[PDB]
């Protein structure tokens, strides 16, 4: 089926400290592979999946150094925004970023993402044409015009269409261990439970009160909902939907 | 592989 | 302030059977700002050694995390998750129901 990569980056400013806390978290087909964290001991892009270990110290200097840039970028930006909105001093603010790319089952580029939130509110976003911006509010217009009258979009486009695809095409080839080999739900009634599935997309029914899908810590997911009445399970990995009652 | 930002907001 | 109240679910990695080692999960979601304290309790006593996992956010920008620790379920004891977060005056405590 289809495939994706995403980096989630958060910077949080703090009263007193002149450097914000910074976390970046990498995801492949919706599953974590790399992470950086500013607070930590002495900080770098630790791997959070075993298949990423075959990348050699060399790849980590590259990425770890990249994360150094982003802190710089997020600090300055944190302070540009304070003025844009007349936020006075001593108060806690948050800037968030999302970027990455979708691939379809043929491995070609479906679409890129590059977007931003301030205080948890949409701020500015790259349109699906990788070439123009949607700005949420009047502050974001400043950013927009800076980014127009400076060609950022193409830079991101170049990362999105090229690099993003190239490396994901590769991570895929490096770790089908807990990726391409998807597993599927074991259901039962005690309310029917689906357990053990991957990916997390699933639907449940009763035929004659939704629990949200939830990590079980080991990489699989679970859901539930509560003779006539019978439960059906729908999933990416079922070679035919499941039907049951018992008890 | 993460992306690098250029121009600030 | 821009603030959102965390949703909480407490549950086991595996369906529980007496005296049979397992993991307990406390999944916390939909909250903002991202700072938060999560505790796991055995009979109102702070369980030692809890791993924090995730801390990223979902496409609606709101934050999620998973807390977890090792445990041998018994039916002589209570288990809960206790959360503290600027959006709530007093800590919230959700109790484990083994059928859920």
Residue numbers in the entry:
A (entry chain A): 1 to 190, 202 to 219, 229 to 246, 255 to 275
B (entry chain C): 1 to 9
C (entry chain B): 0 to 99
The publication says:
The selection of CD8+ T cells into an immune response requires specific interaction between the T cell receptor (TCR) and virus peptide bound to Major Histocompatibility Complex class I (pMHC-I) molecules on the surface of infected host cells. The wt NP366–374 peptide binds to H-2Db in an extended conformation where the P2-Ser, P5-Asn and P9-Met are the anchor residues, P3-Asp is a semi-anchor (partially buried/partially exposed), and P4-Glu, P6-Met, P7-Glu and P8-Thr are solvent exposed and available for contact by the TCR. The present analysis focuses on the cross-reactive (to wt DbNP366) CD8+ T cell response to the mutant DbNPN3A epitope formed by substitution of the partially solvent exposed, and non-prominent for TCR binding, residue at position (P) 3 of the influenza NP366–374 peptide.
The DbNPN3A crystal structure containing the heavy chain of H-2Db (residues 1–275), the β2 microglobulin (residues 1–99) and the 9 residues of the NPN3A peptide was determined to a 2.6 Å resolution, with a final Rfactor of 22.1% and an Rfree of 30.4%. As observed for the wt DbNP366, the mutant NPN3A peptide bound H-2Db in an extended conformation, the P2-Ser, P5-Asn and P9-Met represent the anchor residues, P3-Ala semi-anchor residue, whereas the P4-Glu, P6-Met, P7-Glu and P8-Thr are solvent exposed and available for contact by the TCR. The DbNP366 and DbNPN3A structures are very similar with a root mean square deviation (r.m.s.d.) of 0.44 Å on the α1–α2 domains and a r.m.s.d of 0.20 Å on the peptides. With the exception of P3-Ala, the structure of Db-NP366 and Db-NPN3A superimpose well. However, the mutation of P3-Asn to Ala leads to a loss of 35 contacts between the peptide and the MHC molecule. In comparison to the wt NP366 that makes 636 contacts with the H-2Db molecule, the NPN3A peptide achieves only 601 contacts. Interestingly, the Asn3 Ala mutation abolishes contacts between the P3 residue of the peptide with His155 and the Tyr156 of the MHC and eliminates one hydrogen bond between the P3-AsnNδ2 and the P4-GluO. The loss of inter-residue bonding between 3N and 4E within the NPN3A peptide may also be important for TCR recognition as it changes the characteristics of the wt DbNP366 epitope (defined as type III constraint) into an unconstrained DbNPN3A epitope. In addition, the loss of contacts with the His155 of the MHC is of interest, as position 155, termed the “gate-keeper residue” is involved in contacting the TCRs in all TCRpMHC-I complexes solved to date. The pMHC-I complex with the NP366 wt peptide had a Tm of 51.8±0.7°C and DbNPN3A showed a comparable level of thermostability (Tm = 51.4±1°C), irrespective of the concentrations of the complex used for the assay. This suggests that the NPN3A mutation does not modify the stability of the pMHC-I complex when compared to the cognate epitope.
